[PDB]
Design a protein around this ligand. Structure first.
Ligand SMILES: Nc1ncnc2c1ncn2[C@@H]1O[C@H](COP(=O)(O)OP(=O)(O)O)[C@@H](O)[C@H]1O
Lengths: 476, 483, 511
């Protein structure tokens, strides 16, 4: 009914207002007062909906909306709920104008069909790997909101050098980049310019006895006449004295992740026990490494055993020397998170410029597509475009800017591109969330995957069809 | 019972806070005479909006003094005063007294009167030209009737230039405006002397007379006796020699024949206010009886004739032999409601230059000089020791509310405007005011645009506004009595 | 009684919507009627937007703004007030959710004045002047437009014969066309084919007194007397009552009473009035005076027909017979009492100042003759405005769609706050072709959705067909409207909306 559907709209309208200001990097937080009394404050919108417990059947459709998006993609689930929330506000207005929900469903499915096509006609391929570099520029913008920006080209080049040396396919010619990355640590080398990049993983452990040398160029690395012995089970004092007699550099009580990273970096496999169920064997030339040089570097208060130039490493190690504890700690997370920006861009190879440019540019093509279909599908496809402009309109408030200006300057640049393909027209322009202005994402480096924007518009349109397909209310 | 007086004046400002500036909102004025009016003039709001709270009446009587000796700055009286008391509540929240705050404003009023001449950048050239008056009257057209900046700038200039040669004799009472139903503003014109839209009832063309006098058998016998009675009245007028007779009431069909018999020009004016204008120009008063032949109550005019301007027969009352200082601006408009709104913008322009008959000094507006004035008063407040710092510092922030009104009324954010107005003045870029634009929150130089206020107007506007905030704050409790 | 801010504007927005809803279904030729009752109980059934608002008399001030704006529409155009108030309120509805989003009301005025000036420039771009297109005579093309105005009406079958009288009725007038000079009279009986067109001034002629086979009707150069005096013997206004104390004087009291009518009719013979068109009735005795004196007379005529005769013959209506002279009498070439429809009728043909005409309507029912009067008057208007203004556009809601395409496509390339405001201004222009489908019973969803698809393909003159539930070229269908009308109407609409949006506070003087 007209009043039953109005209650499903006002119900879902408030769910989006709860996670409206939580989306984006400068989003507002909210308190999560459970039934006991514990208050929890978070900024991410995905966990808000997980703990947002409100009894309404029309609201639970949006709870399962993000669960399916969390498993496949795992990001941007909050923006999926806002798109579907605003679509029903406009769809109910169609019903007020004597429009049946059936015609709105078929129009939304075609508006979603052409939305994927127009995205595919504005995609960008994996590039800037050889011959050209803005990946420097792509990572330089990732760290503009921190104090690290005083030295742009120095730290920016370490991001490109740390993401390229870790290349490995390992599955059917997939190549992505693993969850594990370079081990970033800190130091006190009296300055920030002494930060050096080494193309080899360093083990944060001590060499044991002082009489043995901290340098060895042996090929055999025994991972549990190999000199570099690694064992998490522990080695006895009388046992280490025999390695002094043998000339080996043993390390005991090593972490499994640090040993496995070395076994992956050295090409070895972790040996659990020596006894092969009947006797005793050291497993020679079965799980030993292949390396050229192994030396420990003098680090302040936490020495690192540096291994260099293995057979296949796909790893590195950077030392962040600095002046004070504040200067080094802040650049750790700015260096590891800014590296994750280009990591996914170089991996999931079909990407697209985001930053509000997708939903804004789609509002122009689908507007004209409505005037080409007809037959009780124009107002449905026409209003699908106005629902997508709320995402950049929402970020306009989170960025503390004029709500109406940023969305409009973004549309006028994309409109000139459709008039004619000349280079004078601005193409692929986003919005700078840190400053509140337009910004060319191709030069700034605001890229996003293809599976994010495509699946979000499908799940948001499919869920809104479910809430609008409901046309009855029975209570026992 | 002090804050209740502050909340009373605070509400009175918020009504005219939106009617300030060129992008100000209009007001749905419902007259007490069962009439509807729509305008954005702040002076007309208080005439109809009967504010019975006597605490706010002190601000209204100050605004009434802004009509005497000056014809501009009415929003300054209501906005600057209303913002002074809003911040005064912030002081009493801390625990300050009322006398120290009053004394701090009494000192700041003396500091503000000394900074204003320093910000006088340009002034009028004193050439009595039409381009000089029209170029400077753009400030009076602002916020009274937008869009007619081109039409009224020249129309108002034409009536004042005829009197400027009469040095020290320019007055608003010498410029009487008339309005006629028409297509629009394009059909407006300007004429000399007194021009009335009503045509001449008689067939007399021109006359140079100075005497203007403003005012079954038995059944057919008295009917013809009335024709002899009316003839005896025009004969009594012919005995006096008054060839120009202004009729206030209705005219008989036979009187039109006798008016042409003795060669007497007969003009009808049904509007009483138009008849009152003749009382103060030629000396002829309106007599109640049927044409008293009183030679003493007749006026003096060098020439009277009929004219046709804009396809409208209008009688001319000019003075050729005498010097002559009367001018009539005849506007045309289809809607009587909007046509009267233009009539008020004309009176606002005539009175703007009436003050410039004195020492000609002008100051740029648009948030340029108000922040420059608040920037210098804040400097005196920082170094001046004693408890007067809190009152003088907030007296500068009261000047900030005016450009904040120009920002919000223009749809522009109020905080972003003052942040940019203070940055340009920190570098010394004086005379930089807010640019009127719904999309551009930037600023520019107002002197280059041709926006210049009256230095003599801001003086009395800042004095009467601050003295009203003292008169309202001195009264801490209103107590009723029964005579 | 005062209120300001955001919610005050909503009171004026939602108040103007009620005025539009009161005349929402009256737009178009097949629009629904409305019934208004005064204190006397008189019920008026009509679909005229100007008559509805003139009798509603809403005390709310915001509603009075649209009435004064529509009053000017009769001055600048002449009609079409329903399109003004409807389109004036549609601008206020689409901007309602944006007022609550934190936007200032004055920002919309900079957008409406931008779109209003942009639309007037586009009207002159697409407008086509049609004077001698394909060298078809103007009298032929105007009849093709007259049949379109009478299409889907009571005389749709024989509309080809009626069209000859629509254009010829205006051709007999001078260069300045005027509908007030055109009269329409209804005669009981006869078929739709038995209709006629009288270039002279004819009246109902309800004179049902005696005097048959007398008063010779044929005159060569008669003199039309327009009197307002009753010429009855025992007249209610002309009588005598004297009381004397002499038997022989009572005879004289009837003589002096007899002299009231006799002397008054004698001045009519002194002036030489052969035809007397009087407002009040004429008794049976006075009818014989004109018969014996070789004259004609006819009373019981409304005042509407006397003024049509006043400007037709060039005379002036006089009250009494004393001032009856040649300066107020008329003149014509042919005058004869006709028996059209079985009833007697008079008409003056060949006057020097014959700037008027009369249309005789025939039919077997009075309700059929009333609808044809407005259908015929509607066909004269299309023929009237087509002659005065040769530059016309695609009417029937076709031009409102092109304006919605131009202002929307232009607002897309306009950065700043004007995209959703001019965009909503373009979305509000689509309501006229949306409501004419509702006012005609058609499904506005299927028409408007399919109508906009043709303009994207390039349709500039495709619009709504009032007859068939489909889309057709309104320019080829002789559905024309002037350019100045759509120009002067759109500016008045934005003048009403911009004046309502500019107002923010409501003030009431207690008295
Ligand atoms: N277009 C504009 N540019 C700059 N300043 C303006 C503009 N329009 C109005 N103002 C400012 O608004 C103030 C008030 O103008 P006005 O309406 O003439 O006086 P009041 O507000 O007392 O009626 C002026 O001091 C002027 O500086």
């Amino acid at each position: 009914g007209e009043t039953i559907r109005s209650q499903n709209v006002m119900a879902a309208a408030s769910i989006a207002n709860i996670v409206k200001s939580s989306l984006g990097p400068v989003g507002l937080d909210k308190m999560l007062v459970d039934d006991i009394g514990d208050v929890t404050i978070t900024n991410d919108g995905a966990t808000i909906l997980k703990l947002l417990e409100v009894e309404h059947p029309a609201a639970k459709v949006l709870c399962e909306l993000a669960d399916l998006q969390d498993k496949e993609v795992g990001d941007g689930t909050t923006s999926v709920v806002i798109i579907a929330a605003e679509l029903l506000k406009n769809a109910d207005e169609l019903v007020k104008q004597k429009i049946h929900p059936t015609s709105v469903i078929s129009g939304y499915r075609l508006a979603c069909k052409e939305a994927v096509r127009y995205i595919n006609e504005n995609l960008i391929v994996n590039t800037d790997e050889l011959g050209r570099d803005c990946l420097i520029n792509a990572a330089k913008t990732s760290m503009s909101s921190k104090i690290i920006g005083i030295n742009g080209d120095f730290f920016a080049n370490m991001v490109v050098d740390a993401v390229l040396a870790i290349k490995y396919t390992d599955i059917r010619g997939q190549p992505r980049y693993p969850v594990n990355s370079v081990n970033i640590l800190k130091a006190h080398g009296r300055s920030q310019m002494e930060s050096m990049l080494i193309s080899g993983y360093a083990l944060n452990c001590v060499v044991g006895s002082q009489g043995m040398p901290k340098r060895i160029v042996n090929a055999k690395i025994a991972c549990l006449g190999a000199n570099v012995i690694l064992t998490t089970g522990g080695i006895d004092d009388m046992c280490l004295k025999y390695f002094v007699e043998a000339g080996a550099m043993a390390v005991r009580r090593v972490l499994k992740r640090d040993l496995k990273r070395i076994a992956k970096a050295s090409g070895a496999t972790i040996l659990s026990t020596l006894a092969n169920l009947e006797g005793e064997e050291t497993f020679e030339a079965a799980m030993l490494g292949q390396a050229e040089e192994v030396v420990q570097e003098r680090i302040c208060d936490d020495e690192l055993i540096l291994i260099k130039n293995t057979k296949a490493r796909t790893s590195a190690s950077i030392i962040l020397r600095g002046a004070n504890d504040f200067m080094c700690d802040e650049m750790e997370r700015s260096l590891h998170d800014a590296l994750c920006v280009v990591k996914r861009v170089l991996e999931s190879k079909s990407v697209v410029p985001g930053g509000g440019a997708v939903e804004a540019a789609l509002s122009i093509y689908l507007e004209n597509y409505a005037t080409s279909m007809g037959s009780r599908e124009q107002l449905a496809i026409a209003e699908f475009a106005r629902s997508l402009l709320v995402i950049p309109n929402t970020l306009a408030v989170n960025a503390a800017q004029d709500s109406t200006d940023l969305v409009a300057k973004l549309r006028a640049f994309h409109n000139e591109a459709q008039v004619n393909p000349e280079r004078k027209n601005l193409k692929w322009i986003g919005l700078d969330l840190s400053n509140g202005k337009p910004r060319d994402n191709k030069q700034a480096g605001v890229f996003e995957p293809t599976i994010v924007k495509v699946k979000s518009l499908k799940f948001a349109t499919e869920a809104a069809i479910t809430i609008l397909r409901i046309d009855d209310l029975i209570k026992l | 019972a002090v804050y209740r007086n502050i909340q009373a004046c605070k509400e009175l400002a918020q009504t005219t806070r939106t009617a300030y500036g060129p992008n100000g909102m209009n007001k749905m004025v419902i007259n007490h005479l069962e009439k509807l009016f729509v305008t954005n003039d702040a002076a007309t709001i208080l005439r109809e909006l009967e504010v019975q709270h006597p605490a706010a009446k002190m601000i209204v009587m100050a605004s009434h003094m802004q009509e005497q000796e000056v014809g501009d700055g009415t929003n300054f009286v209501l906005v600057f005063a209303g913002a002074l008391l809003e911040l005064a509540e912030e002081l009493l929240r801390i625990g300050l007294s009322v006398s120290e705050v009053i004394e701090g404003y009494e000192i700041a009023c003396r500091k503000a009167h000394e900074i204003l001449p320093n910000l006088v950048c340009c002034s009028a050239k004193n050439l009595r030209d039409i381009d000089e008056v029209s170029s400077l009257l753009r400030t009076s057209i602002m916020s009274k009737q937008y869009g007619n900046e081109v039409f009224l700038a020249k129309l108002i200039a034409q009536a004042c230039v005829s009197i400027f040669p009469d040095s020290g004799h320019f007055n608003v009472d010498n410029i009487r405006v008339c309005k006629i139903l028409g297509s629009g503003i394009s059909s407006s014109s300007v004429l000399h002397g007194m021009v009335f839209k009503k045509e001449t009832e008689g067939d007399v063309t021109s006359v140079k007379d100075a005497k203007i006098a403003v005012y079954a058998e038995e059944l057919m016998n008295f009917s013809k006796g009335e024709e002899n009675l009316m003839d005896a009245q025009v004969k009594a007028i012919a005995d006096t020699g008054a060839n120009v007779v202004v009729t206030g009431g209705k005219v008989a069909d036979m009187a039109l024949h006798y008016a042409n018999k003795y060669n007497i020009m007969l003009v009808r004016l049904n509007s009483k206010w138009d008849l009152r204008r003749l009382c103060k120009t030629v000396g002829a008063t309106a007599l109640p009886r049927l044409t008293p032949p009183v030679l003493e109550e007749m006026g003096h005019c060098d020439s009277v004739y009929l004219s046709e301007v804009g396809d409208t027969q209008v009688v001319v009352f000019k003075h050729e032999k005498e010097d002559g200082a009367i001018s009539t601006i005849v506007l045309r408009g289809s809607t009587d409601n909007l046509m009267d709104d233009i009539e008020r913008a004309v009176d606002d322009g005539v009175n703007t230059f009436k003050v410039l008959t004195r020492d000609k000094r002008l100051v740029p507006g648009g948030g340029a000089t108000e922040i420059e004035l608040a920037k210098q008063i804040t400097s005196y407040g920082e170094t001046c020791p004693g408890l007067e710092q809190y009152a003088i510092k907030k007296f500068a922030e009261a000047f900030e509310a005016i450009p904040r009104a120009l920002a919000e009324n223009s749809g522009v954010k109020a905080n972003e405007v003052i942040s940019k107005l203070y940055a340009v003045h920190q570098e010394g870029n004086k005379n930089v005011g807010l640019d009127i634009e719904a999309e551009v929150p930037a600023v520019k130089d107002m002197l280059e645009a041709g926006i210049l206020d009256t230095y003599l107007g801001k003086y009395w506007a800042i004095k009467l506004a601050t003295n009203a905030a003292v008169t309202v704050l001195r009264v801490d409790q209103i107590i009723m009595a029964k005579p | 009684d005062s209120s300001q801010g955001i919610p005050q504007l909503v009171s004026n927005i939602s108040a103007c919507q009620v005025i539009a809803e009161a005349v929402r279904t009256t737009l178009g030729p097949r629009g629904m009627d409305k019934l208004i009752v005064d204190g006397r109980g008189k019920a008026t059934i009509s679909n005229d937007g100007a008559t509805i608002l003139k009798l509603l008399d809403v005390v709310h001030p915001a509603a009075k703004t649209l009435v004064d704006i529509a009053k000017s529409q009769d001055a600048e155009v002449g009609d079409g007030t329903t399109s003004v108030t409807l389109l004036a309120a549609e601008f206020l509805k689409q901007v309602k959710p944006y007022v609550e989003e934190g936007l200032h009301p004055q920002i919309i005025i900079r957008a409406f004045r931008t779109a209003t000036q942009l639309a007037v420039n586009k009207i002159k771009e697409i407008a086509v002047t049609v004077k001698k297109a394909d060298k078809v005579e103007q009298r032929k093309l105007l009849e093709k437009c007259a049949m379109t105005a009478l299409s889907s009406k009571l005389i749709s079958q024989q509309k080809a014969f009626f069209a000859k009288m629509v254009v010829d009725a205006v051709m007999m007038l001078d260069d300045l066309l005027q509908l007030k000079m055109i009269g329409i009279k209804k005669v009981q009986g006869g078929a739709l084919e038995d209709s006629q067109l009288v270039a002279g001034v004819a009246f109902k002629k309800t004179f049902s007194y005696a005097g048959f086979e007398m008063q010779p009707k044929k005159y060569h150069n008669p003199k039309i007397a327009l009197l307002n005096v009753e010429l009855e013997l025992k007249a209610e206004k002309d009588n005598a009552e004297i009381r004397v104390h002499t038997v022989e004087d009572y005879q004289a009291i009837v003589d002096a009473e007899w002299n009231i009518l006799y002397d008054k009719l004698e001045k009519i013979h002194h002036s030489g009035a052969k035809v007397v068109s009087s407002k009040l009735p004429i008794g049976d005795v006075a009818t014989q005076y004109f018969a014996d004196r070789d004259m004609f007379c006819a009373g019981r005529v409304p005042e509407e027909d006397l003024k049509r005769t006043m400007m037709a013959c060039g005379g002036s209506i006089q009250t009494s017979v004393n001032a009856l002279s040649a300066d107020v009498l008329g003149r014509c070439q042919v005058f004869e009492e006709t028996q059209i429809g079985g009833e007697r009728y008079n008409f003056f043909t060949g006057c020097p100042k014959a700037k008027t005409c009369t249309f005789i309507l025939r039919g077997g029912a009075e309700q059929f003759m009333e609808e044809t009067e407005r259908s015929l008057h509607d066909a004269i208007m299309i023929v009237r405005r087509a002659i005065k203004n040769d530059s016309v556009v695609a009417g029937g809601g076709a031009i409102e769609m092109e304006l919605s395409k131009y202002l929307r496509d232009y607002s897309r390339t306009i950065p700043g706050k004007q995209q959703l405001l001019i965009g909503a201004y373009a979305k509000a222009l689509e309501i006229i072709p949306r409501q004419l489908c509702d006012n005609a019973g058609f499904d506005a969803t299927n028409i408007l959705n399919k109508l906009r698809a043709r303009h994207a393909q390039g349709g500039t003159w495709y619009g709504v067909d009032i007859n068939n539930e489909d889309i057709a070229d309104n320019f080829e269908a002789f559905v024309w409207e002037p350019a100045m009308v759509r120009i002067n109407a759109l500016t008045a609409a934005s003048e009403a909306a911009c004046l309502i949006v500019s107002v923010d506070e409501t003030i009431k003087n207690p008295r």
